[PDB]
Short mmCIF file of C-alpha atoms and ligand atoms in Angstrom, two decimals:
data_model
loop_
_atom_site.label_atom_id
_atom_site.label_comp_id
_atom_site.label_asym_id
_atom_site.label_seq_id
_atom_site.Cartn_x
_atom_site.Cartn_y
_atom_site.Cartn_z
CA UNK H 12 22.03 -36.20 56.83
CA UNK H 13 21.11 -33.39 54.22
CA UNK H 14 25.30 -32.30 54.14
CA UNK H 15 26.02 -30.49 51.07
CA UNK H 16 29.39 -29.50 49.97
CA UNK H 17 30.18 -25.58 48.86
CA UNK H 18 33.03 -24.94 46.10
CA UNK H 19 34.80 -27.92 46.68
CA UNK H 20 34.62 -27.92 50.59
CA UNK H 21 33.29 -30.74 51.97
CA UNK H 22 32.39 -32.06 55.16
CA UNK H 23 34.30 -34.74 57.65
CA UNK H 24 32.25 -36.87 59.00
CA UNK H 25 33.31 -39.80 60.97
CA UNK H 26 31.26 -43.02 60.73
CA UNK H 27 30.07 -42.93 64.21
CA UNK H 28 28.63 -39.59 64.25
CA UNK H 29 24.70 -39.21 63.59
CA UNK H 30 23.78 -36.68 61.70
CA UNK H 31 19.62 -35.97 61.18
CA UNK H 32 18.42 -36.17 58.06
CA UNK H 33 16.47 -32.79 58.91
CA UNK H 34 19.75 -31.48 60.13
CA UNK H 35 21.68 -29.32 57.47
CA UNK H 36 25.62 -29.83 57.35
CA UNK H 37 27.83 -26.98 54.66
CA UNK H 38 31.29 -26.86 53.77
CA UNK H 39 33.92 -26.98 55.98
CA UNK H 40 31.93 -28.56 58.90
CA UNK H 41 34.33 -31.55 60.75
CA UNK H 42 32.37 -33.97 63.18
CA UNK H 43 34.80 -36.30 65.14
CA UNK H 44 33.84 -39.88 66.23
CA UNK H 45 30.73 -40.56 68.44
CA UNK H 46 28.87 -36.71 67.78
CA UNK H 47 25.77 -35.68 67.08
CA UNK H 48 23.59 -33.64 65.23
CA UNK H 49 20.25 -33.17 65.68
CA UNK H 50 16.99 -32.30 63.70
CA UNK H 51 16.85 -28.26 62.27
CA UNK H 52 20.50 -28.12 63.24
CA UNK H 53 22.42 -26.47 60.97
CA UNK H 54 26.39 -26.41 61.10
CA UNK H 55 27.17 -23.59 58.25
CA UNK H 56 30.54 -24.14 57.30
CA UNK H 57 30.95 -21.38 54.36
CA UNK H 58 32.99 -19.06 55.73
CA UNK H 59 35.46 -20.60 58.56
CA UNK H 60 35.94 -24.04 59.60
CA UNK H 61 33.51 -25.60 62.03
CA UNK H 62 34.95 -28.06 64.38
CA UNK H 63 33.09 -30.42 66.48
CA UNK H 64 35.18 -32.49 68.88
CA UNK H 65 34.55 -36.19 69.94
CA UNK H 66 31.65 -36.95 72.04
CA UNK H 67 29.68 -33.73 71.70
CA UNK H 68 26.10 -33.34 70.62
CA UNK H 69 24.56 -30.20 68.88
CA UNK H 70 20.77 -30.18 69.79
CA UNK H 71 17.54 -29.52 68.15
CA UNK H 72 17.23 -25.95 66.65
CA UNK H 73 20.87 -25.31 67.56
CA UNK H 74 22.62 -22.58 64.73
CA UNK H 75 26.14 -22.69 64.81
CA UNK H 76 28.24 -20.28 62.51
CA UNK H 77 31.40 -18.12 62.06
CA UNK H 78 32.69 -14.67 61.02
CA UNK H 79 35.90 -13.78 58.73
CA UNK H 80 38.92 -14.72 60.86
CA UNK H 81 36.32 -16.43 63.35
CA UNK H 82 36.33 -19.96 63.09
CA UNK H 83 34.45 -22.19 65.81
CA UNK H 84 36.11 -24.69 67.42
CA UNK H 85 34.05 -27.02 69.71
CA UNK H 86 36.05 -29.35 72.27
CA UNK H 87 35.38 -33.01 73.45
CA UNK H 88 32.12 -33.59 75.26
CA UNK H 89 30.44 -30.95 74.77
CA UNK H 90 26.81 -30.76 74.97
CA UNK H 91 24.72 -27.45 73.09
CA UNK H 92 21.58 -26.91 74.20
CA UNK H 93 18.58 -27.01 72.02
CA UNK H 94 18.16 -23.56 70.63
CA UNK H 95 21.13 -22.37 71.32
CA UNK H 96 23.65 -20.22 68.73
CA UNK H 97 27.12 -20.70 69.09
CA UNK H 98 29.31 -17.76 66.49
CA UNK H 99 32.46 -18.00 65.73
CA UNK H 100 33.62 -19.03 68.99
CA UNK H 101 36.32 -21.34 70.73
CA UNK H 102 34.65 -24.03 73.55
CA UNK H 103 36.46 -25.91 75.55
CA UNK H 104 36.24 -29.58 76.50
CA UNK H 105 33.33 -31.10 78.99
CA UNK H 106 31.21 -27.69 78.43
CA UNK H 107 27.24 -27.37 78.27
CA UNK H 108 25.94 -25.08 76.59
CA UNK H 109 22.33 -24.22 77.80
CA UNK H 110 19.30 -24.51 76.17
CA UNK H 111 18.71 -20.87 73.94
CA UNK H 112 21.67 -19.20 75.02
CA UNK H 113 24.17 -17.76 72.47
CA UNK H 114 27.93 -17.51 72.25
CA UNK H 115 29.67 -14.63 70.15
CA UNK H 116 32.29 -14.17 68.05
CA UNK H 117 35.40 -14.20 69.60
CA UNK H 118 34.75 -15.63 72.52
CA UNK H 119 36.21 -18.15 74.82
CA UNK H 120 34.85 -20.44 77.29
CA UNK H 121 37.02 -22.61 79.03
CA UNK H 122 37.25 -26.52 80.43
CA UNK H 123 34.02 -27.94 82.47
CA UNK H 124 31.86 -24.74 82.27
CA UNK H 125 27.79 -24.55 82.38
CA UNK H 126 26.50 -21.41 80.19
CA UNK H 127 22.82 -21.09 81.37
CA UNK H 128 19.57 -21.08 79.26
CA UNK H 129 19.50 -18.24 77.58
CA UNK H 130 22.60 -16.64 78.75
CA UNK H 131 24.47 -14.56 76.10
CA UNK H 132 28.25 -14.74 76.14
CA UNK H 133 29.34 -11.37 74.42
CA UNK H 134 32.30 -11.18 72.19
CA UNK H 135 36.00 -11.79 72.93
CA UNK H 136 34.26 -12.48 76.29
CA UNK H 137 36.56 -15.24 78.24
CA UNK H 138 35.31 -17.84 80.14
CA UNK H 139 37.26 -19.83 83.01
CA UNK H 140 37.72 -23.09 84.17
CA UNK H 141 35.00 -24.62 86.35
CA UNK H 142 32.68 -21.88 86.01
CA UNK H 143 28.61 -21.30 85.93
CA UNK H 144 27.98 -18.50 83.32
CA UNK H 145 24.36 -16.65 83.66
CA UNK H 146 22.67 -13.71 82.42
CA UNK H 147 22.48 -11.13 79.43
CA UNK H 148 25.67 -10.33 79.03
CA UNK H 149 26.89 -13.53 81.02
CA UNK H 150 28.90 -13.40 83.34
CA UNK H 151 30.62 -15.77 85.82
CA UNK H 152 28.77 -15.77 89.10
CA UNK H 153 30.41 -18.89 91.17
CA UNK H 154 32.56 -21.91 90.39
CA UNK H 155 30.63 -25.42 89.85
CA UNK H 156 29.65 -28.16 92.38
CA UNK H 157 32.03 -31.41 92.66
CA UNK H 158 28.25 -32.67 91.08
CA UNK H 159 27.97 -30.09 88.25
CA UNK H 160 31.35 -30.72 86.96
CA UNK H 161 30.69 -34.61 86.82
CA UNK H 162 27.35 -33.60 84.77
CA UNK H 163 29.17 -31.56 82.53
CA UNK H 164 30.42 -35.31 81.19
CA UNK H 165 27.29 -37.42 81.93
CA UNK H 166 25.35 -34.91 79.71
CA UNK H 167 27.26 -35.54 76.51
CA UNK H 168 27.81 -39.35 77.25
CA UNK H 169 23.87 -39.47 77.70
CA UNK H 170 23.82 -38.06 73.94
CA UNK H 171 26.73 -40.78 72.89
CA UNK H 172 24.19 -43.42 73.54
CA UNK H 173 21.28 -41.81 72.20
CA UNK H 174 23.33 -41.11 69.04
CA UNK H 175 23.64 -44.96 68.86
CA UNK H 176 19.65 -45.58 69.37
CA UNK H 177 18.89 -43.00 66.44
CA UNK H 178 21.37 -45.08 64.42
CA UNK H 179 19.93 -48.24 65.14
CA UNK H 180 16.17 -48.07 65.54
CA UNK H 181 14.91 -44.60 63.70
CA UNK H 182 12.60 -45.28 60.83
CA UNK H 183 10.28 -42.73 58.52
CA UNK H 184 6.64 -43.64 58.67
CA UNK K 22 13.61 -23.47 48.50
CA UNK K 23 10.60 -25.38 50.22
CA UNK K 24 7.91 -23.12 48.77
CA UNK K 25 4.59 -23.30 49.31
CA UNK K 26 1.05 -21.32 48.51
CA UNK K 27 -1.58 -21.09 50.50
CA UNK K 28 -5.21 -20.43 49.21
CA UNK K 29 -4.01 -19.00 46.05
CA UNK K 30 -1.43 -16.67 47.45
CA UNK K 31 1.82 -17.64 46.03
CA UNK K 32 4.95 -15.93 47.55
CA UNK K 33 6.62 -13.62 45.06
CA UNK K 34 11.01 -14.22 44.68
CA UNK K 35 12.81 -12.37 42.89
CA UNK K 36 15.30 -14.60 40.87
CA UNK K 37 18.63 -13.52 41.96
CA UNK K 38 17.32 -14.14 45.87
CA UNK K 39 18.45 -16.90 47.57
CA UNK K 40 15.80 -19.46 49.34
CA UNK K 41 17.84 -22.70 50.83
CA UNK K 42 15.60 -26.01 49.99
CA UNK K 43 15.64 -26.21 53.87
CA UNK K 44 14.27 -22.91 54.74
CA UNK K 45 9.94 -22.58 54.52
CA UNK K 46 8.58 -19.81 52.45
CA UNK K 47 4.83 -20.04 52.47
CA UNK K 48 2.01 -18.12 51.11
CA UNK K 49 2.39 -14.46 50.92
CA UNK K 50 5.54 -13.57 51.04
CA UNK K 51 7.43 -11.39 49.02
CA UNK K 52 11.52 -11.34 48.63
CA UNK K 53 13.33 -8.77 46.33
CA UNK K 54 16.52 -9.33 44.59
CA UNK K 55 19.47 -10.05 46.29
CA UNK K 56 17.79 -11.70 49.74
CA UNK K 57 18.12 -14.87 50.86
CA UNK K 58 16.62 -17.03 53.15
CA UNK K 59 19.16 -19.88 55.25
CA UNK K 60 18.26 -23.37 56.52
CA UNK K 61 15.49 -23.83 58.49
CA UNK K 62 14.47 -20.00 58.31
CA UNK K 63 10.66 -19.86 58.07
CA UNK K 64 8.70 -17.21 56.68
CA UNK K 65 4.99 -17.91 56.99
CA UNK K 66 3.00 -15.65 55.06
CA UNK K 67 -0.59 -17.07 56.31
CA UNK K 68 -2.01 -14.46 57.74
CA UNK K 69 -0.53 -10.67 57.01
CA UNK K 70 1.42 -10.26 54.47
CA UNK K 71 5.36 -10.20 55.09
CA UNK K 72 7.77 -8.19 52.70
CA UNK K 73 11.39 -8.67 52.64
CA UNK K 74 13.32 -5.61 51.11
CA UNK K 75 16.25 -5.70 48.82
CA UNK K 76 19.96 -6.99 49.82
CA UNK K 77 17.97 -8.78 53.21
CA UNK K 78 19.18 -11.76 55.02
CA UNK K 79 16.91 -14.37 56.88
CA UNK K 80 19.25 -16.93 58.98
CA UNK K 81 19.29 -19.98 59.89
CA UNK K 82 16.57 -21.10 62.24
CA UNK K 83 14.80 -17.59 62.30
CA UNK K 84 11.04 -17.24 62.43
CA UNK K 85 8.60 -14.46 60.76
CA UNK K 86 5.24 -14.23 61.35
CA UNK K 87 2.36 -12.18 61.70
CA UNK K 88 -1.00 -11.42 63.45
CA UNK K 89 -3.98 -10.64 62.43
CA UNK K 90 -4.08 -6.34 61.31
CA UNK K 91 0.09 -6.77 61.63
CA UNK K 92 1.88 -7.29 58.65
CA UNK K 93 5.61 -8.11 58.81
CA UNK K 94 7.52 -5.28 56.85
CA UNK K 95 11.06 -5.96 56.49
CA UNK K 96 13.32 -2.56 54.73
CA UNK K 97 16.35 -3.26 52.69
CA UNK K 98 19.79 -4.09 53.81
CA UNK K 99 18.37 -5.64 56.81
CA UNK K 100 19.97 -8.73 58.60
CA UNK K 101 17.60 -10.99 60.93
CA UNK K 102 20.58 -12.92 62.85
CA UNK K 103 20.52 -16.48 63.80
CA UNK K 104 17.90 -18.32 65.61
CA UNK K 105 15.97 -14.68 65.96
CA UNK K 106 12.42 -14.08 65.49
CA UNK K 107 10.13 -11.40 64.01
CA UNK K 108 6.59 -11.33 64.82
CA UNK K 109 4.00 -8.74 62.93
CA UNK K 110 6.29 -5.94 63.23
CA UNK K 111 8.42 -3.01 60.73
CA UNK K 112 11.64 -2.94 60.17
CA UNK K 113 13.69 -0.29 58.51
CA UNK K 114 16.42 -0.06 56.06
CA UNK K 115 19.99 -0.79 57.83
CA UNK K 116 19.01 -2.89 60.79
CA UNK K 117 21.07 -5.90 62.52
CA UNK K 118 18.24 -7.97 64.42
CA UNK K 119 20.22 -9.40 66.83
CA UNK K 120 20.99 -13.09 66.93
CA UNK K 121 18.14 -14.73 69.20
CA UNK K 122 16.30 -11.55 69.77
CA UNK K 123 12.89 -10.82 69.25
CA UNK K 124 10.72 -8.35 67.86
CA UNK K 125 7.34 -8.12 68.50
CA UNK K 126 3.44 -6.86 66.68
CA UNK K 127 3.46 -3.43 66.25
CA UNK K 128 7.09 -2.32 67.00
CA UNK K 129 8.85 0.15 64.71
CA UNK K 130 12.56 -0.21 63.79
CA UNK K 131 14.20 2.58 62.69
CA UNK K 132 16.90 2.96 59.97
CA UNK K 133 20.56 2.30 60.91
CA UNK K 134 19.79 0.52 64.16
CA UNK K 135 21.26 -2.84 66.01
CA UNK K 136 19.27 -5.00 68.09
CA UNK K 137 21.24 -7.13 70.61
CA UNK K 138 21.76 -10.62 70.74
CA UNK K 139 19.02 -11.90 72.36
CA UNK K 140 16.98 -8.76 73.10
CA UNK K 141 13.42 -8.42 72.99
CA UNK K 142 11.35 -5.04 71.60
CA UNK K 143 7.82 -5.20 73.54
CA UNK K 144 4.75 -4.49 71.40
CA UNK K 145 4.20 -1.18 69.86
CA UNK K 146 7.65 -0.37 70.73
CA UNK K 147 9.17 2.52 68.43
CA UNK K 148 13.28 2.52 67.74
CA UNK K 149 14.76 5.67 66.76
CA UNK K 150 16.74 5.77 63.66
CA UNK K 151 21.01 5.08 64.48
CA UNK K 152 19.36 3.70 68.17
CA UNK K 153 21.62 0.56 70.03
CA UNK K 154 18.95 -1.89 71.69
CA UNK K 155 19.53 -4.22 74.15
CA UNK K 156 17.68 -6.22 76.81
CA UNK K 157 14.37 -7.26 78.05
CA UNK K 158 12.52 -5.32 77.69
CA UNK K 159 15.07 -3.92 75.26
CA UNK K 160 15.37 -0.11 75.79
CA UNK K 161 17.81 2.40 73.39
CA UNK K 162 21.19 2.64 74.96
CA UNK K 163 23.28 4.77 73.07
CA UNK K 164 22.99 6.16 70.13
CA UNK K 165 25.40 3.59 67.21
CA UNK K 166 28.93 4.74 66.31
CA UNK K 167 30.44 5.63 62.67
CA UNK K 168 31.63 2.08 62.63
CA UNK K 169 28.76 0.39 63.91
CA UNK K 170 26.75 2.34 61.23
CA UNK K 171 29.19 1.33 58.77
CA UNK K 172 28.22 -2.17 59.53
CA UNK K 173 24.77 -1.75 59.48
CA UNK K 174 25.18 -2.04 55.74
CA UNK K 175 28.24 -3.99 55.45
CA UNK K 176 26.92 -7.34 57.16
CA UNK K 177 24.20 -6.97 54.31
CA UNK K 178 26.70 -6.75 51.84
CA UNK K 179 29.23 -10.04 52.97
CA UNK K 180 25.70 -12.17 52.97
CA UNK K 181 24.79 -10.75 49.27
CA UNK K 182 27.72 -12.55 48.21
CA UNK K 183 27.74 -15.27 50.16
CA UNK K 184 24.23 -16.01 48.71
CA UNK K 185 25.62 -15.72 45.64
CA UNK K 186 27.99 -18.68 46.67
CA UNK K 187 25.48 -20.74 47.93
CA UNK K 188 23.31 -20.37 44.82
CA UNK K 189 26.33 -21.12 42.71
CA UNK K 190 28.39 -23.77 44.31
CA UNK K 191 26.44 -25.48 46.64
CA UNK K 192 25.97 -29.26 45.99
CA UNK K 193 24.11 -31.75 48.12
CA UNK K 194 26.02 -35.20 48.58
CA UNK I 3 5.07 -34.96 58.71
CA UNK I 4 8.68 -36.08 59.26
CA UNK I 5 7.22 -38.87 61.56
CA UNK I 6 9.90 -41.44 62.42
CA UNK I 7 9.27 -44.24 64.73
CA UNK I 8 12.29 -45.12 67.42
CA UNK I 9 12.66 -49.19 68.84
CA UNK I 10 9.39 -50.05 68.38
CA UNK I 11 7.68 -46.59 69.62
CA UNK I 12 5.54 -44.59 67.22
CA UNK I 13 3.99 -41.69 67.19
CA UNK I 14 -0.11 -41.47 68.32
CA UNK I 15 -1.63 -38.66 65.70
CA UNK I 16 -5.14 -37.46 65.53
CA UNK I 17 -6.59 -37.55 62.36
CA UNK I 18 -7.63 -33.64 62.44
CA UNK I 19 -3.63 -32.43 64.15
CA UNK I 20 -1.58 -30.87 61.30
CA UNK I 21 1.60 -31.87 61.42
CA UNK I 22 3.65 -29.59 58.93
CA UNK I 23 5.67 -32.13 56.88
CA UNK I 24 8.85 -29.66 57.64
CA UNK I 25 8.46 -30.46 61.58
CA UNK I 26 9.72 -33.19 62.96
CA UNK I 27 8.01 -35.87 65.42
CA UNK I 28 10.00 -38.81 66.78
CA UNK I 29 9.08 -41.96 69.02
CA UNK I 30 6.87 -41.58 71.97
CA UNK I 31 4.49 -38.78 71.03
CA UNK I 32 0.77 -38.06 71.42
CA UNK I 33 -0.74 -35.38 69.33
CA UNK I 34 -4.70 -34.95 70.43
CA UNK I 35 -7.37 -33.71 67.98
CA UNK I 36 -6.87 -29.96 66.34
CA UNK I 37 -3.55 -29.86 67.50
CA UNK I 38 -1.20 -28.34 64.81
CA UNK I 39 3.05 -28.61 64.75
CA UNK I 40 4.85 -26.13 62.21
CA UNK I 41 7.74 -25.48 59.94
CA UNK I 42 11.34 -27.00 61.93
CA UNK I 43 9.39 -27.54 65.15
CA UNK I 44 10.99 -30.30 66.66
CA UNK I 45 9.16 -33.31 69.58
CA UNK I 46 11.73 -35.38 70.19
CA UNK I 47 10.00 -38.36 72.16
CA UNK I 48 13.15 -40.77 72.44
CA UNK I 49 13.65 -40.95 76.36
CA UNK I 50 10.28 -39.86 78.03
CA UNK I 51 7.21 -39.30 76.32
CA UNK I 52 6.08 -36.26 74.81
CA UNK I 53 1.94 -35.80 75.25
CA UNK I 54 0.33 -33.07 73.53
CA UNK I 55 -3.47 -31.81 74.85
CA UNK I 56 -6.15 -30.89 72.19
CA UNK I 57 -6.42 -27.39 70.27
CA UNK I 58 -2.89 -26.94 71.22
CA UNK I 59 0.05 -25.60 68.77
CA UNK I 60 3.57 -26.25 68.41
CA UNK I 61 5.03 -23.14 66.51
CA UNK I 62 7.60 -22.60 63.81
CA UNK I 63 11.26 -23.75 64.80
CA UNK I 64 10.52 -25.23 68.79
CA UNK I 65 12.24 -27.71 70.34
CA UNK I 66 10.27 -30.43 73.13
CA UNK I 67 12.11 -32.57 74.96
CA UNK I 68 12.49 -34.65 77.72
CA UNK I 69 15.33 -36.09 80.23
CA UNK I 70 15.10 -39.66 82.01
CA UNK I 71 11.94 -39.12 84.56
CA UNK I 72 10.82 -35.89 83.21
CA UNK I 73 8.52 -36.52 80.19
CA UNK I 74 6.26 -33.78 78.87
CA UNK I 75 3.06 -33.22 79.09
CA UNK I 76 1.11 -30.00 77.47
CA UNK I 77 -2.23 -29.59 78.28
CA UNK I 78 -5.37 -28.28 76.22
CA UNK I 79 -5.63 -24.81 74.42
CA UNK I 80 -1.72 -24.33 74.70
CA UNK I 81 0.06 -21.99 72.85
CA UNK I 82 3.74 -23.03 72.15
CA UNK I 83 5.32 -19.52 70.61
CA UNK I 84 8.28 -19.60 67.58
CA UNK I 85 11.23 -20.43 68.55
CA UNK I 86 10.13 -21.38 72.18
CA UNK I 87 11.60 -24.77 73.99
CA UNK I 88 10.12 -26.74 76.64
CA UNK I 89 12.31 -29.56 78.62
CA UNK I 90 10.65 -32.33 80.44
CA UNK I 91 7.76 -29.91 82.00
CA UNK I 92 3.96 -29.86 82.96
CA UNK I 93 1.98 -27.45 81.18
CA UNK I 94 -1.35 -26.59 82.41
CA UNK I 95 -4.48 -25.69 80.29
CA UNK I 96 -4.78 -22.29 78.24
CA UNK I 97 -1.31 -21.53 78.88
CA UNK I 98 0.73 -18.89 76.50
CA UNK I 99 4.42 -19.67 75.92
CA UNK I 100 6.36 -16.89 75.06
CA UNK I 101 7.74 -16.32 71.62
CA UNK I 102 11.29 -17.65 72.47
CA UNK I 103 10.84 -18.07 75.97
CA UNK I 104 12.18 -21.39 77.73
CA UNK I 105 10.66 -23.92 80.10
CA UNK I 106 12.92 -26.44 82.10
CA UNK I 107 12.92 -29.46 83.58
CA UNK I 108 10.33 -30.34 86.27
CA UNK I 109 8.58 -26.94 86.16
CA UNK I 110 4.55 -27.08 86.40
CA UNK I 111 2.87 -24.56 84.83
CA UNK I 112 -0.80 -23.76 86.32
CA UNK I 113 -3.85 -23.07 84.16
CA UNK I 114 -4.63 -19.50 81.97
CA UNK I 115 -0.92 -18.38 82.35
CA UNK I 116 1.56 -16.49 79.98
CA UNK I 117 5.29 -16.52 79.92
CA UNK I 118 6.40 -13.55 78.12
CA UNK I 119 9.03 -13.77 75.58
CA UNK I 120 12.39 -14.60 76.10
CA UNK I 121 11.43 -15.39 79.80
CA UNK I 122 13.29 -18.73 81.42
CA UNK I 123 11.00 -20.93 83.32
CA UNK I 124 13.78 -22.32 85.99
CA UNK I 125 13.59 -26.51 86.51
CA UNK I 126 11.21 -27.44 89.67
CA UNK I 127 9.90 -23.93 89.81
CA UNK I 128 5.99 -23.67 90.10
CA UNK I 129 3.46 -21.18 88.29
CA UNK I 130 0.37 -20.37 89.74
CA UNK I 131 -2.74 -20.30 87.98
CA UNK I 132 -3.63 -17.17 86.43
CA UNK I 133 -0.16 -15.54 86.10
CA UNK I 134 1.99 -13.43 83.81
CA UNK I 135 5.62 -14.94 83.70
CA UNK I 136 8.67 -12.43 82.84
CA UNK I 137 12.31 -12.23 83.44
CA UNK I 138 15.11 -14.62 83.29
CA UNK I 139 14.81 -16.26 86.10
CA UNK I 140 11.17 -16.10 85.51
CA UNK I 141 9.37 -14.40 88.33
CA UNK I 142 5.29 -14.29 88.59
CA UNK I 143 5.07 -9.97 88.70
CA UNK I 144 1.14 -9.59 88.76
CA UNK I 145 -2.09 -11.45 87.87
CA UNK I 146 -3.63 -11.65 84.25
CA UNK I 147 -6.15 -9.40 83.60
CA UNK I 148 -9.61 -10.24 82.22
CA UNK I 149 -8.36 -9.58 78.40
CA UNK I 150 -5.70 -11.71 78.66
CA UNK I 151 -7.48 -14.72 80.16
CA UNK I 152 -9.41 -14.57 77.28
CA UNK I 153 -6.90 -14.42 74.88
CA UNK I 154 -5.22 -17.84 76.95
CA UNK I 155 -7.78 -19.65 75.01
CA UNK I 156 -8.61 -17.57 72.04
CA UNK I 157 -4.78 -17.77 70.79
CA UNK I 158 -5.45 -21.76 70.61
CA UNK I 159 -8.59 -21.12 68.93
CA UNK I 160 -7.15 -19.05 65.98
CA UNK I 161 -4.55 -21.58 65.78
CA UNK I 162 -6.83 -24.76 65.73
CA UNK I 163 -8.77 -22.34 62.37
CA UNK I 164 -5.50 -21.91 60.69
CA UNK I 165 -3.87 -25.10 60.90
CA UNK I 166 -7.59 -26.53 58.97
CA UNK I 167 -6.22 -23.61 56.53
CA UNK I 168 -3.27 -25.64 56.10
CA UNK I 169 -4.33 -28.73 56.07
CA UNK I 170 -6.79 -27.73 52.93
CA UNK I 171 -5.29 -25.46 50.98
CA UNK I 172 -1.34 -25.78 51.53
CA UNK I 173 0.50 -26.58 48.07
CA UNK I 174 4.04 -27.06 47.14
CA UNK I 175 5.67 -25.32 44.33
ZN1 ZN F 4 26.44 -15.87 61.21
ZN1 ZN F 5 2.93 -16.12 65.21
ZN1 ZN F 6 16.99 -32.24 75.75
#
């Protein structure tokens, strides 16, 4: 939990989701059915909308944020790395983000993409289809495996059912 | 908030600063009017002493530290992005720290300068003042533009008042 | 603390680890004597289990994980740097993680080695003993010298004094 509300905005969370209690929710933050945050992640919804699509998980750590005009839009089954910053950016559907990396404002990554650890997508920067994203600034360097794009789904439906075992069985000691 | 002394030393905030309940201020630490520190920013103050200037911003999931004979010294108008980390070193007034970068013991930041998203100043490294940084290590590139300096100040500014929203209208639910 | 139990697994704590109550430990986690976990780090032991070797420390906002076959295991004297993250690894004895650095899956880290900041540890990928880690991927580039074999262990050391600091003389206020 820990979701706070900021001058009248407040967050849309549907049942299913699981939110940490050490994970920190603001504002204008919407979390469809089946997501996931996780502990220190912090969804800061006080300056433009923060979407978060069915099925997708936001990891351990993660930061996610937005810019005047920026708003960040995150698709269905989408999986972001522990660590990682995503800023006022649009993400497509079946997308992992990897562990550490960042995403800037502005920018686009398309359907079934895989952002490396610590890659840095620069702003406005647009991302295609199918594609592996690596270094600092990232850039595309080949299209993914018929086995990377099936992961780019396992990896968030691993999370779905995770989700579900936090829901069920966690307990403070 | 989520303050906390250590062996006497008591961090010293300024009233009109911002510290969110989820962010860690312990020890010595001091923060001068108009900062504020965002969820799970952590400012441990158990060894050297770290100083936040005026009109500073600490985000979310950001660490500052110190080592032993390295003080953390941040100047005023100063914003320490996302998920970013700052380790023993000096920071002037009118610095970005890029989001996921890192600075490390005994670097010197200039005034007016913009580290980039997850760059990394080496040890002992010394910025210029109006100096662009990026990579790792992260080396001066270019020397910043009229807007870019412009900004140096304005991103200050926008988080000043968003504080100012956050210490007015937030409301945990 | 923040120490939550998941289906029946709970966490194993040495009486002399400090375990900030701002981190967060989950499920199948072993924490050996004079270990120490700060502010937002996060061990997340819900799939594989998380094992963590004597007079080792677990810095301000980390993330350790694990994915199905790939639990992790941290050996003694280990120094886990802020904002670091290491996924379902091996890490030897008197071994350095790099402030923000990042350790994947199935990596094995040999003994008295340092990953410099920022560096990415690719999954499978094998460190010798004895060597300095940089880059992104991270490449071995020389030897450590006789300084900084020292410091492999010394870094733990301070550590294991400072988090008896905390455990003492930490207060809320
Ligand atoms: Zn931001
Ligand atoms: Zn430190
Ligand atoms: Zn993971």
């Amino acid at each position: 939990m820990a979701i706070y509300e900021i001058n009248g905005k407040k967050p849309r969370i549907h049942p299913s989701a699981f939110v940490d209690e050490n994970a920190v929710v603001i504002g204008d933050v919407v979390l469809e059915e089946k997501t996931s945050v996780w502990p220190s992640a912090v969804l800061r919804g006080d300056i433009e909308q923060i979407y978060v699509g069915k099925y997708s998980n936001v990891q351990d750590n993660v930061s996610i944020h937005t810019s005047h005009g920026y708003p960040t839009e995150i698709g269905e089954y989408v999986t972001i790395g522990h660590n990682a910053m995503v800023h006022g950016a649009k993400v497509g559907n079946y997308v992992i983000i990897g562990i550490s990396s960042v995403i800037l404002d502005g920018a686009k990554i398309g359907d079934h993409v895989i952002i490396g650890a610590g890659a840095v997508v620069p702003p406005n920067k647009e991302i295609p289809d199918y594609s592996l994203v690596l270094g600092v600034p990232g850039k595309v360097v080949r299209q993914l495996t018929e086995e990377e794009i099936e992961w780019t789904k396992k990896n968030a439906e691993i999370y779905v059912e995770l989700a579900e075992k936090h829901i069920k069985g966690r307990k403070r000691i």
